[PDB]
C-alpha cells in the first residue's frame, strides 16, 4: 500500500470511530489506523520529494507518525480496559495529529 | 512571569487574533504569545519535579513548548507577509498544541 492508501485508511477509520454502531468497532478501527500510520512513516510525501531523508522536514514528517501511534496506543489501552467511551473521546483528539502534519506537508 | 500568567497570555491573545482583521494586530498578538511560550518553556511543572530532566515525560513536555513556539513562529511569518487570514487560520490550529499538552500533563 502507498501513502494515498494509508491516508484513506486513516480517514475511513477515524470516521468509523466517530460513527461506530457498537463499542467493538472502535478497537478494530484504531488497530487499522496504527498499521496505516507506521506504513505511511516509510513513504516520501510529494512535497518533500526533493529533500534529504535527514532534512528537518523528513524528520518532522516521520516523527508525526511516531507521535500519532503513541496516542493511538493510549486509546487502544483505554479500549482494552473496557473504557470504550473514553477511547472514542481520545480518538476524536487524533484529528489534531492529522491537521498538524497536513498543515506542513499535505 | 509564572506559569499561570503565561497561560493567561496565550489564552487571551488567541482571541485577540480571532477578533483581528489586519496584519499588525495579528503580528502583535503572536509576538506576545511567543514571549509567553518562551517564558514557560524551560521550567519543570511541579507535577514532574521528581522526574529526571531527560525522562520521557519531561522530554515530551519540553517538546510541547518547543513545538508550540515553532508554529507561533510560522504564523508570525504569515502575518509578516500580510497574509492576515492564513495567519489567523494558523493561530486557530495552535489550540491543538494547548489541548495536547493539557491532556498529558494537567
Ligand atoms: C504526517 C505525519 C501525516 C499525518 C499524521 C497524517 N497525514 Fe494525512 N497526509 C499526509 C501527507 C504528506 C499527505 C499528502 C499525500 C499525497 O500523496 O498527496 C496526506 C494526505 C491525506 C489525505 C488525502 C490523500 C489523497 O488521496 O490525496 C487524507 C484523506 C488524509 N491525509 C487523512 C489523514 C487523517 C484522517 C489523518 C489522522 C488520522 C492523517 N491523514 C494523518 C501526512 C500525514
Ligand atoms: C505544555 C507543553 C503546555 C502547552 C503547550 C500549553 N499549556 Fe496551558 N497549561 C499547561 C500546564 C502544565 C498548566 C497548569 C499549570 C499549573 O500549575 O496548574 C496549564 C494551564 C493553562 C491554563 C489555566 C491557567 C490556570 O491557572 O489554571 C490556561 C488558560 C492555559 N493553560 C492555556 C493554554 C493555551 C491557550 C495554550 C496554547 C496556545 C496552552 N495553554 C499551551 C501546560 C501547557
Ligand atoms: Ni503526546
Ligand atoms: Ni510542526
From Swiss-Prot, chains A, B:
Keyword Chloroplast carried by entry: no
GO biological process per UniProt: electron transport chain
Binding site for heme b: 7
Region (Disordered), start-end ranges: 38-60
Required cofactor names: heme b
Subcellular location per the Swiss-Prot or TrEMBL entry: Periplasm
One GO cellular component term: periplasmic space
Comp. bias intervals (Basic and acidic residues): 47-60
Any GO MF annotation of the entry: iron ion binding
Known partners and oligomeric status: Monomer.
Family named by the database record: Belongs to the cytochrome b562 family.
Function per UniProt: Electron-transport protein of unknown function.
Protein name, UniProt field: Soluble cytochrome b562
Boundaries of the shown chain within the full protein: 23 to 128 of 128
